[PDB]
Amino acid sequence: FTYRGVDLDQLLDMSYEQLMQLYSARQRRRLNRGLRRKQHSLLKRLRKAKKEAPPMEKPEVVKTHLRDMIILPEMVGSMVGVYNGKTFNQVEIKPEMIGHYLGEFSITYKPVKHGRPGIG
Amino acid sequence: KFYEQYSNRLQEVLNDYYKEKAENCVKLNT
Amino acid sequence: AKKRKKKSYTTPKKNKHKRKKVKLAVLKYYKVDENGKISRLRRECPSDECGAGVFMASHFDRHYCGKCCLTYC
């Protein structure tokens, strides 16, 4: 795996200002603006839940409503439940899915399969 | 009574206000 | 007019959270000697208005008055 010619190890140890240059424009904007309180709380929680785990086992799932959250390289490895208006979706955060938002994983609508029409 | 009627600490709170208004958007910590 | 039936349904709101009643908290402030000397256990607040009588709370590390919001180490 490599992201913009940068490896995961480098990414993790990288400066926060240096990521504001190694992302897509939106993400850069967001990081300039700053992470909101809730987001910070979420991140801290994640840090806790990955820390308090057996080395062989996958970490315990953290449930959240924040689908406006951007995935940082620090979240890679963790399992997160994201609310889609009704139900949670337990999502393992992969290295590939950093430059995305948590929202695009838990889909908010059921896909359409058409029933046969009535009196029109 | 009814008819016959008619700073150091401030600067601490002020600095606490800006402290909070910095912690709402972090943009730094790892 | 056509009257409504009124339905039953039972959901218990009998269990509700109330803060604990601390009985006789005045003896914790002062230790009275056998002779008759008064010794104060807690720090007294030296604020603008709440002096001479109002005590500060004993936190695990610090002291805190309960009228003016004064905090220490």
């Binding site: - | 009814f2 008619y6 401030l10 709170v13 002020l14 909070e20 208004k21 | 003016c68």
Partner: protein
Amino acid sequence: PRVLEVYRGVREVLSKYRSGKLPKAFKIIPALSNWEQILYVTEPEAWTAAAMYQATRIFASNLKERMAQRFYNLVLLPRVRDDVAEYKRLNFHLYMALKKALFKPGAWFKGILIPLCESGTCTLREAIIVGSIITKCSIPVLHSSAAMLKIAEMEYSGANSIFLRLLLDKKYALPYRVLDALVFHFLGFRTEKRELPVLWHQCLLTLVQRYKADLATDQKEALLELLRLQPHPQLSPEIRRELQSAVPR
């Protein structure tokens, strides 16, 4: 200086307030020396309804009855009158504020009730909305009777007798001088050619329905003279009934 930038910031918070923990600078306003200058920067007229409830919640608890009264008179009471005139019914937070304002009854009466009836411009709808809060919250007997005495001595309006009835509706044991003012109040309409509303008769009804035990023969027969000059087809026989079946002392 820099303090002017802090409170100009919270001015934009309280104008868009709905919920949550308020900034700590706002919670220490009655602790200040020059608080009325600070309050003008925050702009109380531009505040949200939800903010107004927690503003009142601050002033009622932080002692100083004189400082509490002047907040209600300048900020809270005008806003109440502003919304009854506009929306015709009162906002929920604004209503909840008035119940919280009764934690200091002295500052409540001297700031909300007495200044409202003294203005004269107080409408019937304004009176019932505020008057219902008196019925909900229990009030100290000394303060209850003190407000009752002023209204009895006051100039007569339709809105005025609503409050007076609701205070008697509480059914506390009354001071004897207050009873003398109340009798003198109603006997002031004994020679009046003006047509009296139904709310006036109901106030006279509630007075006799409860306090028939504390009426002497002199004032008792003076009341029968009042009903003989100012009658009602429905209510006047009931007051006549309640006076005739009364045991004194």
